[PDB]
Amino acid sequence: IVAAVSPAGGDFSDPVTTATLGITQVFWGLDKKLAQRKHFPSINTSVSYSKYTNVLNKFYDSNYPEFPVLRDRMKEILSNAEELEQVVQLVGKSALSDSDKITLDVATLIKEDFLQQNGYSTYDAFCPIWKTFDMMRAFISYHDEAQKAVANGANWSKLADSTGDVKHAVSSSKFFEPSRGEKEVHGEFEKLLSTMQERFAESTD
Amino acid sequence: AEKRTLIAVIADEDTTTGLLLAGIGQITPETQEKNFFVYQEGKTTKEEITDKFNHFTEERDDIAILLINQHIAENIRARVDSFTNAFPAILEIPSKDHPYDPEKDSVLKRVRKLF
Amino acid sequence: EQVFPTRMTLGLMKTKLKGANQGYSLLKRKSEALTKRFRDITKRIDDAKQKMGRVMQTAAFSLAEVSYATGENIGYQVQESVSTARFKVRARQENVSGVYLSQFESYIDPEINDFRLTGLGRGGQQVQRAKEIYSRAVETLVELASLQTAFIILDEVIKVTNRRVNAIEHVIIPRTENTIAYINSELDELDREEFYRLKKVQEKKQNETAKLDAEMKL
């Protein structure tokens, strides 16, 4: 079954939602803000859950043994974003460290080029599982590389300019049409990751 | 602003000569304007001081720091007190021929409250 | 104490109250962080003010006793000879507490100060003696202005932040609290009426069934 509830104003106080939340195993809450900005699909990652995330590892490990840790890393990055949101809005981004602005600008990148999707197109109407895994790995790797670059010592304000196109490539990674096949996308992702690693290696000098 | 490079001096010759000797100033032939308005005791009025203060502060973006004698500032003391901006870094320099008092400073007036 | 709503937007006001409280808590300490440096630089400027007021006079005396060793005027040639600048300044940046502060760096250029003013034969050596005294004095004087700039900027920033904190404390929190109390009262006001309606329905039903059963006994 896949039900659907209509939030009659408060999307948590109506008795229907309260009754359903006690017996359902998954929940995809609705947030007014992502709808108001016209951000589709608009589902709230702060209040939602999927109890099946445990029993799925038997399939994952036999298929994609890295998927869970990548998911955990992405979730914690996202959470840190909104955690810093209150302070950065009430004061203004003027004292943030160099390892934190990386988190801000990676959370925005993810929120704009991973969780954003439009089914009224051809390249992205049904994203397969391997494509999602590849995109997810690429984003995590980019974040880790930026953090490493600042750790070794370099002002990120100029490191962003020095890197440049490697930030755009991932943002365009969502255009590898599945129709191309399954290996002809895997090769593209491999070369993208290698190019990213080399660019980060050579830009520290 | 990075144009805050030149230094303004409105002081008696006994100090201006030495200041230029230290190499702080020069001649600006583009306007034939010195980095200072030389001062003559008992020969220079007070309106000239006000005009040069305004010229150095609100007409010249070159000046970063202004040095003025206590007695010269006394002629524009009201003008100096009224004007309070961070750009010119106004400084009441000690004056030759007078034992300078480090308590006539317009800047120090605000220091004199809320210790 | 605003344009009173009455809906179930209580959670919205509750979240706004937490946001305001967090902002107040953070700003009340960001104020003190800068107040520390304000206190420091106040003394740093005040103590050195008179020290400089006296050392500058000492240097002026040192050159004054030099100006007539050659027994002739030097100023007339000085005020025209000077055409190169060395003791200029540069804008140094230092965010003490996330606040911009364009400081002054003494851009000392000890390669030329004034060309062709020594070696006339009577006073070239004498002027070379007290000149470096002023070269040091001007570098020392740069820092006093560097501190005054920071003083003014810090005063401005502390003033604005303290004003904002006072405003938030005094004319924001109580308004939201009054609004929350009003909405809380309204909710119970509606609950009472719903309860009364249900009570009336139950009374009617029990009276009707009592009539019916008391009739059916015969």
CATH number at residue C174: 1.10.287.3240
> In angstroms, how far is the first alpha carbon of chain B from the final one?
31
Sign of the alpha-carbon dihedral angle for A152, A154, A155, A156: negative
Pairing of strands B63-68, B6-10: parallel
Cβ–Cβ below 8 Å for B27 and C83: yes
Contact predicate C89/C107, CB 8 Å? yes
A107-115 long-range contacts (CB < 8 A, ≥24 apart) are A107/A77, A107/A78, A107/A80, A107/A81, A108/A81, A109/A139, A109/A167, A109/A170, A109/A171, A110/A74, A110/A77, A110/A78, A110/A139, A111/A78, A111/A81, A112/A171, A113/A170, A113/A171, A113/A173, A113/A174, A114/A139, A114/A174, A115/A45
What's the CA angle centered on C79, arms C78 and C82, to 5 degrees?
A: 75
Q: Examine residue C217 and state whether it is found in any structural domain, yes or no.
A: no
C39 to chain B, any CB pair closer than 8 A? The answer is no
Pairing of strands A48-50, A26-28: antiparallel
Method by which this entry was solved? cryo-EM
Q: Does the N-terminal peptide bond of residue A41 adopt cis geometry, omega within 30 degrees of 0?
A: yes
Rounded Cα distance, C122 and C91, in Å: 41
Other C-beta atoms closer than 10 Å to the C-beta of C17 total 16
Q: Which residue has the tokens 């003027």?
A: A94
Other C-beta atoms closer than 10 Å to the C-beta of C111 total 8
Rounded Cα distance, B66 and B87, in Å: 10
Contact predicate C37/C203, CB 8 Å? no
User: To probe the interface with B, which of C43, C88, C104, C115 has the most B CB atoms within 10 Å?
Assistant: C88
**CB-hemisphere CA count at 13 Å for C84?**
11
Rounded Cα distance, C48 and A170, in Å: 57
What's the CA angle centered on B75, arms B73 and B78, to 5 degrees?
A: 80
Cβ–Cβ below 8 Å for C135 and B23: yes
What's the CA angle centered on C156, arms C152 and C158, to 5 degrees?
A: 115
Rounded Cα distance, B98 and C185, in Å: 76
| CA-wise closest residue to C104 among C134, C143, C135, C138 | C143
CATH number reported for the structural domain that contains residue B100 in this entry: 3.40.50.10580
* SS3 (DSSP) at C5: coil
- Domain assignment of residue A180, given as a range: 51-205
| CA-wise closest residue to C114 among C82, C85, C88, C92 | C82
| CA-wise closest residue to A169 among A198, A145, A143, A189 | A189
The residues, any chain, with a CB within 8 Å of residue C151's CB and separated by 6 or more, are: B107, B111, C38, C41, C42, C45
The residues, any chain, with a CB within 8 Å of residue B28's CB and separated by 6 or more, are: B34, B35
Rounded Cα distance, A114 and C186, in Å: 44
Structure tokens at C78: 């000085």
Rounded Cα distance, C60 and C123, in Å: 18
Pairing of strands B90-92, C88-93: unpaired
Rounded Cα distance, B77 and B54, in Å: 13
Which residues in chain B touch residue C109, judged by CB atoms under 8 angstroms apart? 23
- Domain assignment of residue C57, given as a range: 7-209
The residues, any chain, with a CB within 8 Å of residue C163's CB and separated by 6 or more, are: none
Q: Examine residue C132 and state whether it is found in any structural domain, yes or no.
A: yes
Q: Examine residue C166 and state whether it is found in any structural domain, yes or no.
A: yes
Q: Please give the single-letter amino acid code of residue C201.
A: V
What is the nearest CA distance from C1 to chain A, expressed in angstroms? 24
Cβ–Cβ below 8 Å for C19 and A10: no
Rounded Cα distance, A163 and C149, in Å: 37
Rounded Cα distance, C37 and C156, in Å: 13
Q: Please give the single-letter amino acid code of residue A94.
A: S
| CA-wise closest residue to C31 among C161, C167, C208 | C161
Among all residues of chain B, which has the CA nearest to that of C91?
B2
Rounded Cα distance, A175 and A186, in Å: 13
Rounded Cα distance, A195 and B113, in Å: 62
Rounded Cα distance, A176 and A32, in Å: 31
The torsion angles phi and psi of C44, rounded to 5 degrees, stand at -55, -35
DSSP state of A191: H
Structure tokens at A47: 């209040």
Q: Examine residue C198 and state whether it is found in any structural domain, yes or no.
A: yes
Among all residues of chain A, which has the CA nearest to that of C97?
A95
Cβ–Cβ below 8 Å for C148 and B24: no
Q: Examine residue C216 and state whether it is found in any structural domain, yes or no.
A: no
Rounded Cα distance, C74 and C127, in Å: 9
The residues, any chain, with a CB within 8 Å of residue A99's CB and separated by 6 or more, are: A147, A150, A151
| CA-wise closest residue to B9 among C135, B26, B1 | B26
Cα dihedral angle (C170, C172, C176, C179), rounded to 10 degrees? 80
Rounded Cα distance, C8 and C11, in Å: 7
Rounded Cα distance, B20 and B28, in Å: 13
DSSP state of B22: T
Q: Examine residue C90 and state whether it is found in any structural domain, yes or no.
A: yes
**Distances, alpha carbon B2 to alpha carbons B31, C100, C146, in Å:** 20, 15, 14
Pairing of strands B33-34, B90-92: unpaired
Split into its structural domains, chain B has a count of 1
Helix (H) or strand (E) segment spanning residue C93: strand C88-93
Split into its structural domains, chain C has a count of 1
- Domain assignment of residue B14, given as a range: 1-115
What's the CA angle centered on C136, arms C135 and C140, to 5 degrees?
A: 125
Instruction: Kindly tell me the number of DSSP H helices and DSSP E strands found in chain B.
Output: 5, 5
Alpha helix positions (H), chain C? 10-67, 75-81, 124-171, 173-216
The residues, any chain, with a CB within 8 Å of residue C20's CB and separated by 6 or more, are: C168, C172, C173, C176
Contact predicate C60/B96, CB 8 Å? yes
- Phi-psi category of residue C183: left, alpha or beta, with phi > 0 → left and psi -120 to 50 → alpha: alpha
Cβ–Cβ below 8 Å for C85 and B94: no
